[PDB]
């Protein structure tokens, strides 16, 4: 047998950020919500805070954009690099440069799972199993997979065992399911604009929004509702039943992440055939074990928030073992390379970054160079035939390096 | 009726830090683990990382001390101030100065619960329900209660409805239960030094450690084991049964926080009469609802990590409703003022900050001025008869202010 390919050790790990409270607001990139004004993603979206008059119209007003984008780049001894982006910004840089670097530098570029376990174990006392700290860990994990793929010379999807479908079909999230249908998407997920404090009027208005789009899009184009942790079991139950006549495919993240018991009850109360989903804010495989056992239909981890690709692959197996689907939240290429290899991820999400949902602005615009976007609502596997996650870091963005080591 | 006491509005909120990766290592204060060398708290303590040779001897080596102390001070329009400390450091300062300040400034000093709900709702998308972000929220909550108490002129324990006992009796956590007995404590909790990877030898060694202290302390002095998230169900079960002959009162935090299902199984497998506890790393009332339902005997939230005093009081009611006890993790005065009013907190914890557990070095030494310490293993309620949490900020420490607004 031939001698194996020689692999370099990891030399440096660096972290930068753009956007967030200490940089330029509206930088976009990794933080989906770090947008400018007049953006659908900030237009009276129901949230745990919209019950407050001062925070009802804008999520930005309560600080959904304070973190900004975290960028992690790992450089091997042979000078090759790999990178990834997520939501964490400056604080994410602290974690990487002042803590996690000790487990990263000096390792082989193939020691991905090892570094992953060490990051989880070393931060367990302050990670809270999700959110900020997990977003940071996820970003490092993705940067490592990117570097490994670029060193080996293969797309991440091939390293994982290959594609199980020739193309990824997408549904679009935004305020214009009708325009999404025109673009070729298979469905459209809309955000709810009213919450529990709005009562029956709120239910009537969001249900009317769904009815209107059903009329405009026809019966086969899927329609879904995203509730961004803004409701309670009763309100979610009433809304789901109010939308049943229009064949709403699923109602998403109705409750805060810790409310597993509530999700179990909500799923039990759901109209026959209508799915209940959640997961974008959950982190760690164990949390997904608990979430899966509530009986919800689809878990939706964000690859950059759940713990990384390493964790995503485990979550996919968990769901598959139960005969269920896993449909990641956004994530662009970080999701594409993974889900195209998952038999139980028949479709993916494309979260509209276009202010009015009329164009195909890239998912992480503009931090990723040559970022692929759906063509006729799909991304063919050949589009992913590039090393690692197939993109390059846009250094024309004003990247800030708050910490060093 | 007389006109009510006039209350000022909150003018400023400021955040500082000491210790941590960007300051002086070993600063102590809020971060219990930010100690120097030769400290029992870093002496081969079993952890999720001790299975790794390079991280077996020292928790500091894997970074248990990177955060340091977060200090939050709230100033009212009448110039009176209130403050609190916790574990979060520089990153905690970012959260307070760049995000949470918008919900704090301008409110009445009595709007504590309102600010609390807004902090939770606004950070839900990145808090992960515990850890770093929750520690920060908790610190703000405590600072608010401190300010309110100082403005009103009453100790927090009286504002809460008064003491239900004349003194708080303590058990001591550290490597010397025998010295703790001499000091007047009612029991001693020791850390385990070996983990699953050590197998039967590890169980034999930690059990022998317990047997030795039982011999030295007698039958009535309580002995407990702290496992700092380092085990799995089987190992914890074996260790608990190995310690049953010595009447180990309880075995604490055997599993990582997300493993609710494991805790349920462990409690079921526990020797008759032996308690199973956890909770110091959990956050948010909902997580404690789930933890409580696993059947464990005592939940141990840290007042500065679980969400604050506001959350602690709710957790106490949850436990009380189930006929169970709540015994907070460390927390000094932040716990004292609360638990002295809880019928279901018959005793409290004093975590030895003394390197060799031979003296009564204050719990948060040296960031808190005039910090009370147990006398004969107890703290009489009269010791707490000072405004707010009864202490002042030691500004002789080199406090750093990384952010402004
Ligand atoms: Mg969603
Ligand atoms: Mg403990």
Main beta-sheet annotation of chain A: 9 strands, mixed
By CATH, the superfamily of the largest domain in chain A comes out as Enolase-like C-terminal domain
N-to-C SSE string of chain A, H for helix and E for strand:
EHEEHHHHEHEHEHEHEHEHEHEEEE
Q: CATH fold name of the largest domain in chain A, please?
A: TIM Barrel
Q: So what's the oligomer here?
A: homodimer
Binding site for substrate (chains A, B): 33, 59, 349
Enzyme class (chains A, B): lyase
Subunit structure (chains A, B): Homooctamer; tetramer of dimers.
Function (chains A, B): Catalyzes the dehydration of L-rhamnonate to 2-keto-3-deoxy-L-rhamnonate (KDR). Can also dehydrate L-lyxonate and L-mannonate, although less efficiently, but not 2-keto-4-hydroxyheptane-1,7-dioate.
Quick tags:
2 domains; TIM Barrel; 405 residues; globular; Enolase-like, domain 1; 3-stranded antiparallel beta sheet; 9-stranded mixed beta sheet; L-rhamnonate dehydratase activity (chains A, B); binds magnesium ion; homodimer; 34% helix
What report would you give on this structure?
The structure is a homodimer of 405-residue chains. Chain A is an alpha/beta fold and 405 residues long. The first copy, chain A, folds into 2 domains: 1-153 and 395-405, 2-Layer Sandwich (Enolase-like, domain 1), CATH 3.30.390; 154-394, TIM Barrel (Alpha-Beta Barrel). Helix content of chain A is 34%, strand content 16%. Chain A is built from 12 helices and 14 strands. In chain A, strands 4, 5, 6, 7, 8, 9, 10, 11 and 13 form a 9-stranded mixed sheet that branches. In chain A, helix 8 (233-243) runs parallel beside helix 9 and helix 10 packs parallel to helix 11 (309-321). The longest helix of chain A has 21 residues, at 132-152. Chain A is globular and about 65 Å long. Chains A and B meet through helix 2, helix 3, helix 4 and helix 10 of A and helix 2, helix 3, helix 4 and helix 10 of B. The complex binds magnesium ion (MG) (2 copies). Chains A, B: InterPro entries: Enolase-like_C_sf, Enolase-like_N, Enolase_C-like, L-Rhamnon_dehydrat, Mandel_Rmase/mucon_lact_enz_CS, Mandelate_racemase_C, Mandelate_racemase_N_dom, RHMD-like. Chains A, B: The record marks 349 as: Transition state stabilizer.
């Amino acid at each position: 047998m031939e001698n194996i390919m020689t692999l370099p050790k990891i030399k440096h790990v660096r972290a930068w950020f753009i956007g967030g409270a200490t940089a330029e607001k509206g930088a976009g990139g990794g933080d989906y919500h770090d947008q400018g004004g007049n953006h659908w993603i900030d237009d009276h979206i129901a949230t745990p805070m919209s019950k407050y008059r001062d925070y009802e119209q804008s999520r930005q007003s309560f600080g959904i954009n304070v973190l900004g984008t975290l960028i992690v780049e790992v450089e091997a001894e042979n000078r090759q690099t790999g990178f990834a982006v997520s939501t964490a910004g400056e604080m994410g840089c602290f974690i990487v440069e002042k803590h996690l670097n000790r487990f990263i530098e000096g390792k082989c570029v193939s020691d991905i799972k090892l570094i992953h376990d060490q990051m989880l174990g070393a931060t367990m006392y302050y990670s809270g199993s999700g959110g900020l700290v997990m977003n940071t860990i996820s970003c490092v994990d993705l940067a490592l997979w990117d570097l490994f793929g670029k060193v080996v010379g293969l797309p991440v999807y091939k390293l994982l065992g290959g594609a199980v479908r020739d193309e990824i079909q997408f549904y679009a999230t935004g305020a214009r399911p009708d325009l999404a249908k025109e673009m070729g998407f298979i469905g459209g997920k809309m955000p709810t604009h009213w919450g529990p404090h709005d009562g029956d009027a709120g239910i009537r208005k969001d249900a009317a929004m769904v009815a209107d789009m059903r009329e405009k899009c026809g019966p086969d184009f899927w329609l879904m509702l995203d509730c961004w942790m803004s409701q309670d079991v009763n309100y979610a139950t009433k809304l789901a039943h109010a939308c049943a006549p229009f064949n709403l495919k699923w109602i998403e993240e109705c409750l805060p992440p810790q409310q597993y018991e509530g999700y179990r009850e909500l799923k039990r109360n759901a109209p026959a055939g209508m799915m209940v989903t959640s997961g974008e804010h959950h982190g760690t495989l164990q949390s997904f074990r608990t979430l899966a056992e509530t009986g919800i239909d689809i878990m939706q981890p964000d690859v950059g928030w759940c713990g990384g690709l390493t964790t995503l692959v485990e979550i996919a197996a968990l769901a598959k073992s139960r005969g269920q689907l896993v449909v990641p939240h956004g994530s662009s290429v970080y999701s594409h390379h993974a889900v195209i290899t998952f038999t139980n991820t028949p479709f993916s999400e494309f979260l509209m970054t276009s202010p009015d949902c009329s164009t195909l602005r890239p998912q992480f615009d503009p931090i990723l160079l040559d970022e692929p976007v759906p063509v006729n609502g799909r991304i063919h596997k050949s589009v992913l035939d590039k090393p690692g996650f197939g993109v390059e870091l846009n250094r024309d963005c004003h990247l800030k390096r708050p910490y060093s080591h």
